[PDB]
Design a protein around this ligand. Sequence first.
Ligand SMILES: OC[C@H]1O[C@H](O[C@H]2O[C@H](CO)[C@@H](O)[C@H](O)[C@H]2O)[C@H](O)[C@@H](O)[C@@H]1O
Length: 404
Amino acid sequence: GPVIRVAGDSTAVGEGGRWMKEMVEAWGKKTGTRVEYIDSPADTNDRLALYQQYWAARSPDVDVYMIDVIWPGIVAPHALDLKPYLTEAELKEFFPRIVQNNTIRGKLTSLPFFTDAGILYYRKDLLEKYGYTSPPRTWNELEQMAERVMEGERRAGNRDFWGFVFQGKPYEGLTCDALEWIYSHGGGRIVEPDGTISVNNGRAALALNRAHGWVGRIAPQGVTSYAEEEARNVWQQGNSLFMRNWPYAYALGQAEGSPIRGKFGVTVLPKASADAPNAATLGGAQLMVSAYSRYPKEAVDLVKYLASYEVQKDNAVRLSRLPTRPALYTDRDVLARNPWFRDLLPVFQNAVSRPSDVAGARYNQVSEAIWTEVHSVLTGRKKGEQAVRDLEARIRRILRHHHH
Ligand SMILES: OC[C@H]1O[C@H](O[C@H]2O[C@H](CO)[C@@H](O)[C@H](O)[C@H]2O)[C@H](O)[C@@H](O)[C@@H]1O
């Protein structure tokens, strides 16, 4: 019979790739269909380049791809339109914002699978030890807490201890972290939904200078090479007061044998002042059937299974990843395991999107400009003022003649 072949997620990021393979195997067992799992590199931008090789070749060797929230405008020609395969009722079981995201020129490129939002992880034990009762609400507070706790922990002998870890590597994750910094300083969305390239402003430049100020001070010098997992490893070993990361890190930190089990909470990222907007970058994954799959019926059946209530529930319960079905945020077992899903649901609902809608198929070029210019600030090569001026000019060149 057919072999249905899936590329999606990575065994190099938490449990995602292992779990995905498990879920695909479970569908194959349930339906009596042969399946195969193709692994991917850790970073989303590397995965895009890999999958583009298959798409350029019109390759039938992958039937289902997991695609990033930022990808529908890029990948649409390589996607089978799913609209004819779902009833309106079935589609309404997902968040409408994400279905809209996934719909390009009327083509439903992909089903919503899990969503994602940047959050603050904090060591509750350490906040209590140093006389703090609440996590920080402002970036200045975060810096003050970090300096005090670091001084104390270093003095106590932990030479591995830092105040803050985040994703500073030059890749798509830095675009995510930098949108949060800029937006939380009142600096805008980098490129607004209407097309205005807004980043050349003093608030954005301040946000980037502030982040530079962390490097080698409250954050390790090596933070300029950290993706999700590098940050998570320092944090999970017990060596950081604070971390910015996605929801997946929570279940991993609570696993038996984690040095930090029971010692942490999560909250919204800080912001520059009380009237700035909360910032949590929208992330997450969708499920696409390849336009090149020889087995579209079967592939669609697999994608409906993966996006189903019970598989999303398993993802929430075991991997602390966020459902794309509003019903699951009221499910007793999801909430018992992850009470913070209820506390931070409004943060997830108000997550700020990267400019993938407005940049469309040029989004990856825009993002590479963002992360390279931002990285130049983190490394001390450019000041934020120059970087945002230079980034404005780059993005203007990239998007010249593009209309959404
Ligand atoms: O949260 C678990 C996921 O982390 C990565 O994906 C997030 O971070 C990317 C940037 O590095 C974003 O583009 C993406 O939207 C986020 O969901 C990782 O790539 C995923 O495999 C993990 O599931």
